[PDB]
């Protein structure tokens, strides 16, 4: 019953050897400021991936 209790997909080709999927992430912050301020903080982002066979 391995094929009935788990999902099955065909988004793969008969001539493929590997596949990969990607993931993303972010960083940032905020502060309490005055009105004549010019030192606001910053943010950024990044990512990564993983493979198969």
């Amino acid at each position: 019953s391995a094929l009935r209790v788990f999902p099955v997909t065909t988004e793969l080709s008969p001539t493929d050897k590997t596949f990969e999927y990607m993931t993303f992430d972010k960083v940032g912050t905020a502060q309490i400021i005055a009105d004549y301020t010019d030192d606001l903080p910053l943010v950024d982002a990044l990512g990564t991936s993983e493979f198969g066979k």
Binding site: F24, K26, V27, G28, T29, A30, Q31, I32, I33, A34, D35, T37, L40, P41, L42, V43, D44, A45
Partner: protein, 212 residues
């Protein structure tokens, strides 16, 4: 009332690359800025700021605090103690205000939901069902921020009445995303917002059960 702000930077080559590859980079940074603003508001509400003289709900000096025995000790459960302490907190709300206000809402750590689901012996219902039957008109919910109330690892439970005349939060100005200011070959985008915090007009309608 206070003001909050941040900013982000991006160049022209990154804009061209994002348009070419189909994965823009400015939208992610804008989302990060908005998330930072919201998380700062939440942190202000649930932790306060000592230099700014902002007091958290847990550190208010005029709310009722109840020390309690542990609902889970040595990996065994004590539903009876939990029920007794909840009834005691509701009675405290009823008594201290001399019947003018009545408790309406309870907030518990999400890791204590298993204690209240235990089936009572020799019957087909749990402690929560009996408590709700005997305390009609009270809602129970689980909040993650109650997993740590002092930064050291202790838990707590909140019993209160949710009415606009007892406590309030104000957001006078919303996220705005000011225009972009050019430079040599890049840009700078600032973002601002406004908030106040938690204002507790009647501090006797809140009970905090510590040591849970």
């Amino acid at each position: 009332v206070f003001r909050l702000g941040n900013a982000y930077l991006i160049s022209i080559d990154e804009i061209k690359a994002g348009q070419a590859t189909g994965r823009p980079l400015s939208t992610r940074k804008a989302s990060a800025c908005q998330l930072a603003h919201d998380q700062l508001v939440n942190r202000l509400v649930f932790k306060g700021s000592a230099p700014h003289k902002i007091v958290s709900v847990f550190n208010h000096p005029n709310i009722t605090k109840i020390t309690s025995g542990k609902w889970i000790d040595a990996s065994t459960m004590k539903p009876e103690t939990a029920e007794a302490e909840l009834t005691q907190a509701i009675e405290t709300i009823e008594t201290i205000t001399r019947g003018q206000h009545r408790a309406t809402n309870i907030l518990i750590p999400p890791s204590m939901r298993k204690v209240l689901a235990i089936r009572m012996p020799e019957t087909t219902m749990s402690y929560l069902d009996y408590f709700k039957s005997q305390n009609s008109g009270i809602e129970i919910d689980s909040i993650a921020e109650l997993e740590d109330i002092d930064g050291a690892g202790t838990k707590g439970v909140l019993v209160y009445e949710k009415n606009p005349m007892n406590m309030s939060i104000e957001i006078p100005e919303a996220f705005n995303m000011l225009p972009a200011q050019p430079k040599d070959l890049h840009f700078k985008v600032p973002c601002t917002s406004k908030c106040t915090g938690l204002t507790i007009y009647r501090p006797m309608t809140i009970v905090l059960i510590t040591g849970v």
